[PDB]
Amino acid sequence: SMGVRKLATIRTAGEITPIAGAEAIECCHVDGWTCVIKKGEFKQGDRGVYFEIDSFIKEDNDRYPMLSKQVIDYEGQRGTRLRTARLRGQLSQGLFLPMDRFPELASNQVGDDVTEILGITKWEPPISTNLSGEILGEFPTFISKTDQERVQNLIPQIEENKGQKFEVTVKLDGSSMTVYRKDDHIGVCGRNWELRETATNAQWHAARRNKMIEGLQFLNRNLALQGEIIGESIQGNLEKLKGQDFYLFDIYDIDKAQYLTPIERQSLVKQLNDNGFTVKHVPILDDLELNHTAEQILAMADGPSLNKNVKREGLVFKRLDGKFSFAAISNAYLEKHKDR
C-alpha cells in the first residue's frame, strides 16, 4: 500500500472564467479545484499538469520561473510549497501548467501520476527535535501511510457512493504517529521513519504514557495503531492541551494488508481501554448517509475541533465497509493557518 496522495497528475482543464483588473490571469476549474492560470495558457479541454496544494517543487527557473520568487528552504533544498491563496477575491489552490513545459510527458494520458516522474515531494509542517528524534530505520513497508485522498479529487466516487454510510471524524492537526506490532517486535514511527526510544522522543513518550505498547500485546495481533499526536509544542497547541497525547484514527491489519473497518476499530479501542490501556480516539461524529455534493461536504468540514472554540482542520469520512475513505479539509482553516 502506498498511502500517499498523488501530488502531480495529468488533468483536463474545466470551465475557464475571467477575473477583472490587470487580468493577465483567469480562473481555471480543475476537477474539484479552482486555480488561477495565466492568460491564454489553456483552453477548456486542454491537458495540463496539476500540482496539488502541499506539493514541494524544487527551484528551476527554466521549468518553474513563476515560482522563483516564492521559494523557501525546505529539508535543505530551495523550492516552493504550494499553498492556498486568494487572488482578487478568487480562491486559488494548486498549480496548473500546460504540456509545453513537459515534453517528456508527451505520451502520458489523463489521470497519470507524474509525481515521481517530475521529482515532486510532499511538503509537511516543521516538527521539533522531540518529534523527529534519532531515526532508527525506514518506515515499515508492510504498513500503509496515513494520508487521505481529498474530496476535490473524488467527485465521481462521491456520487457513486450515494446511499452508503460513513464514519465521520474530526481531523486533528498534529503529527502522524504509528505504533505497531509484528511478531515479537513492537515499534514506534513518525510520519516517514521508524523512531527510536530516546527518552526525549515524543512519539515514544506518548506510547509509554498511555501503555498502548502493553495494549498491543494484550491484543497479540500484528496491528498498526495509527493516530495523531497533538499538544504542547505541536502546531502551536490550539487544542490547549497540557502535555502531549495520542489520538487514534486507524488500525491497519498488517497480515491482511488492509485497514480495519470503523466497527472493527471501535471494537479494539473499547477492549484496550477496558483493560487499563487508555488509548484516546479522534472525536467521532454522527454517522452520515452520503447524499451530498463536494461543496456540501466541504461546508461540513468547517466546525469545532477537539476543543470546541477552536476551528478544526477538517473531517475524515470512512465507509463502514472500510474500503473507501476520504478527507474534507476546511478551506477557512487553510486560509487562516497558512503556516500549515
Automatic annotation (TrEMBL):
One of its GO terms (molecular function) is ATP binding. Mn(2+) 3 binds at D147. ATP 2 binds at R5, K122, Q148, R150, T169, V170, L172, R191, K318, A327. ATP 3 binds at K122, T146, Q148, T169, V170, K171, L172, R191, E228, K318, A327. AMP binds at T146, T169, V170, K171, L172, S176, E228, K318, A327. Mn(2+) 4 binds at D173, E228. Residues 165-329 form the RNA ligase domain. SUPFAM superfamilies: DNA ligase/mRNA capping enzyme, catalytic domain. ATP 1 binds at R5, K122, T146, Q148, R150, T169, V170, K171, L172, R191, E228, K318, A327. Keywords: ATP-binding, Metal-binding, Nucleotide-binding. Mn(2+) 2 binds at E124. Mn(2+) 1 binds at D54. NCBIfam families: RNA_lig_DRB0094. This is Predicted protein.
